[PDB]
Amino acid sequence: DSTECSNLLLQYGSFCTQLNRALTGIAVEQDKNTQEVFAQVKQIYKTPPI
Amino acid sequence: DSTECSNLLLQYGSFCTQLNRALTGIAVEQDKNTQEVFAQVKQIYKTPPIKDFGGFNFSQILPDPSKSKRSFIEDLLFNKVTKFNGLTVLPPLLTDEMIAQYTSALLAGTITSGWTFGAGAALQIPFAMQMAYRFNGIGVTQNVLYENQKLIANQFNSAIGKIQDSLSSTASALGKLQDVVNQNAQALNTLVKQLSSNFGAISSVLNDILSRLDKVEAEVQIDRLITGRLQSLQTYVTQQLIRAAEIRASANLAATKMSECVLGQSKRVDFCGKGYHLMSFPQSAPHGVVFLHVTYVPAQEKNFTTAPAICHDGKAHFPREGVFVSNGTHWFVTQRNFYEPQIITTDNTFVSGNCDVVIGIVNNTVYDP
Amino acid sequence: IDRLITGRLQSLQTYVTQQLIRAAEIRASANLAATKMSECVLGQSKRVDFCGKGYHLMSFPQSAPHGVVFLHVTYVPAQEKNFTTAPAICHDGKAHFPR
Amino acid sequence: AYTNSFTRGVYYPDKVFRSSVLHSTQDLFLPFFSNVTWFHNPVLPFNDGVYFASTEKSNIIRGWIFGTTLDSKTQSLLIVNNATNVVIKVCEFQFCNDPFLGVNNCTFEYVSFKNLREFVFKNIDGYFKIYSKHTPINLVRDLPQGFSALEPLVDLPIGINITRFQTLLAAYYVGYLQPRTFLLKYNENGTITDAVDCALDPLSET
Amino acid sequence: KCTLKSFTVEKGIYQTSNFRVQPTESIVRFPNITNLCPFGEVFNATRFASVYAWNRKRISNCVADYSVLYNSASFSTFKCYGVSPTKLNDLCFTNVYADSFVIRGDEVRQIAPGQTGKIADYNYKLPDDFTGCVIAWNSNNLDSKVGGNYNYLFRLFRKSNLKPFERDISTEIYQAGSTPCNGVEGFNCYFPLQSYGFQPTNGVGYQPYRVVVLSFELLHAPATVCGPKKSTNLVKNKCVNFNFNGLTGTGVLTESNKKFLPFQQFGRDIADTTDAVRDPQTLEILDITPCSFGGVSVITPGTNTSNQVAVLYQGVNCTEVNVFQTRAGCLIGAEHVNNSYECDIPIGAGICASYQTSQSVIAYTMSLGAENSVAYSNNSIAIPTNFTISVTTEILPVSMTKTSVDCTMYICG
Ligand SMILES: *[C@@H]1O[C@H](CO)[C@@H](O)[C@H](O)[C@H]1NC(C)=O
Ligand SMILES: *[C@@H]1O[C@H](CO)[C@@H](O)[C@H](O)[C@H]1NC(C)=O
Ligand SMILES: *[C@@H]1O[C@H](CO)[C@@H](O)[C@H](O)[C@H]1NC(C)=O
Ligand SMILES: *[C@@H]1O[C@H](CO)[C@@H](O)[C@H](O)[C@H]1NC(C)=O
Ligand SMILES: *[C@@H]1O[C@H](CO)[C@@H](O)[C@H](O)[C@H]1NC(C)=O
Ligand SMILES: *[C@@H]1O[C@H](CO)[C@@H](O)[C@H](O)[C@H]1NC(C)=O
Ligand SMILES: *[C@@H]1O[C@H](CO)[C@@H](O)[C@H](O)[C@H]1NC(C)=O
Ligand SMILES: *[C@@H]1O[C@H](CO)[C@@H](O)[C@H](O)[C@H]1NC(C)=O
Ligand SMILES: *[C@@H]1O[C@H](CO)[C@@H](O)[C@H](O)[C@H]1NC(C)=O
Ligand SMILES: *[C@@H]1O[C@H](CO)[C@@H](O)[C@H](O)[C@H]1NC(C)=O
Ligand SMILES: *[C@@H]1O[C@H](CO)[C@@H](O)[C@H](O)[C@H]1NC(C)=O
């Protein structure tokens, strides 16, 4: 949160967008991975009482 | 153009060759990925002149000669999906017409010969008899096809027609291919915008530095641009090497689906779509493949009383290839995937010793032919 | 010296990154070779073109430097003849199907 | 008295042709739907730059004065429409604006309700910029809806510092420019059409 | 061989170089030559400035050409200090000035950096590091008069020396004793001016020379003066280096069908690369295409097979470079062949090359396999009668060399 550094970091262009975009793609994959493993069942089947 | 920059860039040595070696390794791999998927047929099995396939109607997925000679659905797929600063884009080895000749050969061989063209020479089989083998392969007896053949054929024609023409109504189905187009375009635009960036230099325009500054200081400002532009170009080829590894995984999966679905019949659950798999047809799409998996799904939910075995002359009988079921008053044996009751005979069944051992055995009669 | 440190460090980061990406491709090939050992050598695969082109009978592993060779043995049908065929035959007014 | 600015005053940010494209820029602009002052003749602060717009039928507005003092001690800018022409000059002037027809320590000179005029005035020591547009309207006292794009008239060589301004003499409105990010819809003819004020609301930011 | 660092090459296609179409000429374009600076008033007047009270012009808001002053035969001497007279036509300034006076032929030499004596110390003072040029010309026909032209005067006496660039017009009576002069001549009290007494008969050291001194300032307010701008003819459909209004680039210039607005000067593509310009000398909008470039690839059988090769210019048209225009680029030294075969060496877009029959590199459209019609009918089946047992070799990478690097031993060692 230094304003003096922040104005220099703008002179590096797209790099900081390109990293935060890469981590967002990795974040969304973790939900996809979990959905593809567990959500294979169409209905919440449940066991008889006895 | 700048010989000043070109001479400064020599101090970094081999990096300029490493990045082009890495991009060449990726570029050679598109052509391998498409040959592993499509080029797994030895001969071009044409298409027969007379369309006597029982009731089954492949005209939506067979070639259209009025057009590349794509099928109808294969032309919907292309329509729903469909540079300068030292950057160049290279053509694929197989053209879209050569890939459409391969999907044509694969489904023409499948329709006329079954799985036989995968194991050796294509052997002709009437299409209704190929479908009876594929029913027999999912544990449903052949006569369940021949006795229902017009129903099965109408129900296939409805599913491959009415429902699959949903691709005319919506483009959002092809999101996996559109994503691969968008990611490569957005990476390549990000590589170009990085030329406008200063990286701490007095200007991002290379001739502007050389026109404004004394030669010893101009070399400091240019080395600032070289450092940032080289890091930008390394970031791009690193992300393309990582992205090409997921495309290789998808191409190895698609090549495996082309062998095990399509030119086989897979017993692997949920591999070739939901339900008990019968067939699949490949259709080409830009940068990808589409499999139309044909599959058998059962349809009832009321009940029968059942037993593991039945007693007769003090001996326990077990069903030879089926289940024992009662309609409430009478006992039958059925095949297990489709309700077709049969009288319990000594050749519907096999004995295994005494009545006393089995838990839940029932007393009934076994008929002797 | 800091110019040499900066350049040689970046040279070594570029090597290690491409080595990590290349090791992932060798791991995918070793996971495939362990699956071919299990399903082709320790079993008989009913899985089309997994254990060579043809109907798979069996397979044998041989060592190679940094790899494995599988010698896949397969039945390949040959010398076919054309016949007339029928889905069923009709006898005493009843339809018979081949067992 | 106050009035709402709506979505007006989108001057072309640079002399570049662009087409079928959505360009992003960070210039000094009217923030959308902001309040502006309404008038129908005070000396006013200039801030970071001015938007001015007026109900054109009678042509009663004659020009403007800009500078720091506007009244001796240092050079100040006069711009006036002398009927067929416009006179631009930057002397150490010292006058009231009300006697407009009556108006050396000087270094430059140059000569150039039925409607809305729209004009924008901007400076950065790197020469003094005027943009404008004109459009027909209904007989309404305040700014109408829709987008308006303002075209660069002149970029005058003056080098004068400005903190204050005044007008020579319809309704007229005064708003101020602010550092703002905009997304601009250049159509197939390379005219700016629609625009998004990226800091207005979360949907615009999206 | 040099690309591969080897004396042996295996069969393949190798990218060995990149080639680019070079610019055939340089184009420069600027607006019509207009608002040329008003220097002539300082030289061509009937009157002239008198050195005891010299006159300055201001030059601003205009384009100069100082090279007129060092090419015209109208002047007897030209001198310059600090910066070259040619460099003045490259430079730019917030204001420019021209000082003027008449001096006798023996005393024009006082107008130089760091000088001393009557003219230098009491009439016109230049510092030791002055930047500017001085123009002097004999004016005995204009400025001399019978008995002397007493309008031309120099200050002989002053209270103190001038500072550098100090202008003074003072005419106060000089005092040379304790007696107060009360603003008039008298005992030890004298008029501070003298005349060269310019007469038409005078020898050259006593003849009038008109003189002008150029001077400049560049300030935080941007330059209102610059030197002259070049321009060239306009050439199209050829690769050229170009400079429109200071915008440098290299490309092919063409006609366009774009509709620029009257204030717009150049047009941009989606990635903020220029793709069109207005010619400042017409209403023509010109489209810009970058000059044709691509990889050069060498197509070879093995070096123990043949030294013959073909060359592919990737994405380049054969117009720009026995010859064959593929979709992948111009191919040279390969024979096009109307047959088709398995793909031996891949080129792209369905094209491959091989070494074949008297032998050469050939290029052909690749064959996907033999065409076959399966003998399908609704009652025909084919059944195998034999089974040829087949052994196939599958080979897989399983591991890699266990290399390790100490980064401190590699970096420093
Ligand atoms: C096959 O289906 C198409 C519609 O998709 C229809 O036009 C055609 O007549 C059908 N073919 C036959 C032999 O009935
Ligand atoms: C048959 O199974 C259904 C499954 O939903 C169940 O609701 C029903 O109770 C069963 N029938 C009888 C007679 O219990
Ligand atoms: C059970 O099957 C037999 C033979 O089809 C039929 O006669 C009998 O009525 C059935 N019983 C019930 C409860 O439906
Ligand atoms: C089945 O369940 C019923 C009710 O729980 C019970 O009466 C019967 O004895 C059970 N039979 C077997 C074979 O488990
Ligand atoms: C089954 O039949 C036998 C006689 O064959 C009898 O002894 C036995 O009790 C019967 N069991 C049931 C559950 O009815
Ligand atoms: C008869 O069988 C052979 C088997 O190779 C096949 O080539 C041929 O096409 C068949 N005959 C006809 C008339 O199709
Ligand atoms: C663009 O320019 C053409 C020709 O001047 C004109 O016909 C068209 O209406 C303009 N607008 C659009 C949106 O194309
Ligand atoms: C050497 O020649 C043989 C036969 O022409 C060829 O197979 C091989 O690829 C060649 N190798 C090299 C390195 O030239
Ligand atoms: C090659 O360039 C010439 C001249 O521009 C043109 O006539 C020709 O059609 C071009 N050919 C291809 C395939 O681009
Ligand atoms: C290829 O065949 C066409 C047939 O019209 C002919 O014109 C052409 O000259 C042939 N090419 C060569 C290189 O012989
Ligand atoms: C089967 O093929 C072998 C050669 O592979 C041949 O020797 C043998 O005679 C053939 N048998 C028949 C019955 O055709």
Swiss-Prot record, chain A:
What job does this protein perform?
Precursor of the fusion protein processed in the biosynthesis of the S protein and the formation of virus particle. Mediates fusion of the virion and cellular membranes by functioning as a class I viral fusion protein. Contains two viral fusion peptides that are unmasked after cleavage. The S2/S2' cleavage occurs during virus entry at the cell membrane by host TMPRSS2 or during endocytosis by host CSTL.
Q: What is this protein called?
A: Spike protein S2
Residues represented out of the complete protein: 745 to 794 of 1273
From Swiss-Prot, chain D:
Disulphides:
91-106
The residue ranges of the BetaCoV S1-NTD domain are 1-206
Relate the outcome reported for changing residue 137 to V: In strain: Omicron/BA.2.75
Q: What is the effect of changing residue 62 to I?
A: In strain: A23.1
In terms of superkingdom, the source organism counts as Viruses
Q: Which residues are glycosylated?
A: 35, 82, 105, 161, 189
Region of interest: Putative superantigen: 187-206
Q: What result follows from mutating residue 55 to I?
A: In strain: Iota/B.1.526, Mu/B.1.621, B.1.1.318, Omicron/BA.1
Function description: Attaches the virion to the cell membrane by interacting with host receptor, initiating the infection. The major receptor is host ACE2. When S2/S2' has been cleaved, binding to the receptor triggers direct fusion at the cell membrane. When S2/S2' has not been cleaved, binding to the receptor results in internalization of the virus by endocytosis using host TFRC and GRM2 and leading to fusion of the virion membrane with the host endosomal membrane. Alternatively, may use NRP1/NRP2 and integrin as entry receptors.
- Which proteins does it associate with, and in what oligomeric form? Binds to host ACE2. RBD also interacts with the N-linked glycan on 'Asn-90' of ACE2. Cleavage of S generates a polybasic C-terminal sequence on S1 that binds to host Neuropilin-1 (NRP1) and Neuropilin-2 (NRP2) receptors. Interacts with host integrin alpha-5/beta-1 (ITGA5:ITGB1) and with ACE2 in complex with integrin alpha-5/beta-1 (ITGA5:ITGB1). May interact via cytoplasmic c-terminus with M protein. May interact (via N-terminus) with host bilirubin and biliverdin, thereby preventing antibody binding to the SARS-CoV-2 spike NTD via an allosteric mechanism.
- Please identify the protein, giving its name as recorded: Spike protein S1
Which gene codes for it?
A: S
From Swiss-Prot, chain E:
Mutagenesis / variant outcome for changing residue 185 to Q: In strain: Kappa/B.1.617.1
Q: Where is this region: Immunodominant HLA epitope recognized by the CD8+?
A: 149-157
Q: What does the record say mutating residue 197 to S does?
A: In strain: Omicron/BA.1
Q: What segment(s) does the record annotate as region Integrin-binding motif?
A: 104-106
The effect of residue 76 to F is: In strain: Omicron/BA.1, Omicron/BA.2, Omicron/BA.2.12.1, Omicron/BA.2.75, Omicron/BA.4, Omicron/BA.5, Omicron/BQ.1.1, Omicron/XBB.1.5, Omicron/EG.5.1
The segments labelled Receptor-binding domain (RBD) in the record are 20-242
Q: What is the effect of changing residue 40 to D?
A: In strain: Omicron/BA.1, Omicron/BA.2, Omicron/BA.2.12.1, Omicron/BA.4, Omicron/BA.5, Omicron/BQ.1.1
Outcome of mutating residue 370 to V:
In strain: Beta/B.1.351, Iota/B.1.526
Effect in UniProt of substituting residue 191 to L? Increased resistance to neutralizing antibodies and human covalescent sera neutralization
Q: What is the effect of changing residue 72 to F?
A: In strain: Omicron/BA.2, Omicron/BA.2.12.1, Omicron/BA.2.75, Omicron/BA.4, Omicron/BA.5, Omicron/BQ.1.1, Omicron/XBB.1.5, Omicron/EG.5.1
Q: Mutating residue 141 to K: what's the consequence?
A: In strain: Omicron/BA.1, Omicron/BA.2, Omicron/BA.2.12.1, Omicron/BA.2.75, Omicron/BA.4, Omicron/BA.5, Omicron/BQ.1.1, Omicron/XBB.1.5, Omicron/EG.5.1
Q: What intrachain disulfides are recorded?
A: 37-62, 80-133, 92-226, 181-189, 239-291, 318-330, 343-352
Query: Changing residue 153 to R does what?
Result: In strain: Delta/B.1.617.2, Epsilon/B.1.427/B.1.429, Kappa/B.1.617.1, Lambda/C.37, 19B/501Y, Omicron/BA.4, Omicron/BA.5, Omicron/BQ.1.1; Contributes to cellular immunity evasion and increases infectivity
Q: Where is this region: Disordered?
A: 20-36, 156-191, 220-242
**Consequence the record notes for mutating residue 47 to T:** In strain: Omicron/BQ.1.1, Omicron/XBB.1.5, Omicron/EG.5.1
Describe what happens upon changing residue 157 to L. In strain: Omicron/EG.5.1
Instruction: Region Receptor-binding motif: list its residue ranges.
Output: 138-209
Q: Which residues are glycosylated?
A: 24, 26, 32, 44, 304, 317, 338, 357, 378, 386
| Ranges where the BetaCoV S1-CTD domain occurs | 35-228
Q: What is the effect of changing residue 199 to R?
A: In strain: Omicron/BA.1, Omicron/BA.2, Omicron/BA.2.12.1, Omicron/BA.2.75, Omicron/BA.4, Omicron/BA.5, Omicron/BQ.1.1, Omicron/XBB.1.5, Omicron/EG.5.1
UniProt effect for mutating residue 118 to N: In strain: Beta/B.1.351, Omicron/BA.1, Omicron/BA.2, Omicron/BA.2.12.1, Omicron/BA.2.75, Omicron/BA.4, Omicron/BA.5, Omicron/BQ.1.1, Omicron/XBB.1.5, Omicron/EG.5.1; May enhance affinity to human ACE2 receptor
Quote the protein name from its UniProt record.
Answer: Spike protein S1
Q: Output the lineage of the source organism.
A: Viruses, Riboviria, Orthornavirae, Pisuviricota, Pisoniviricetes
Gene field: S
Section of the entire sequence shown: 300 to 744 of 1273
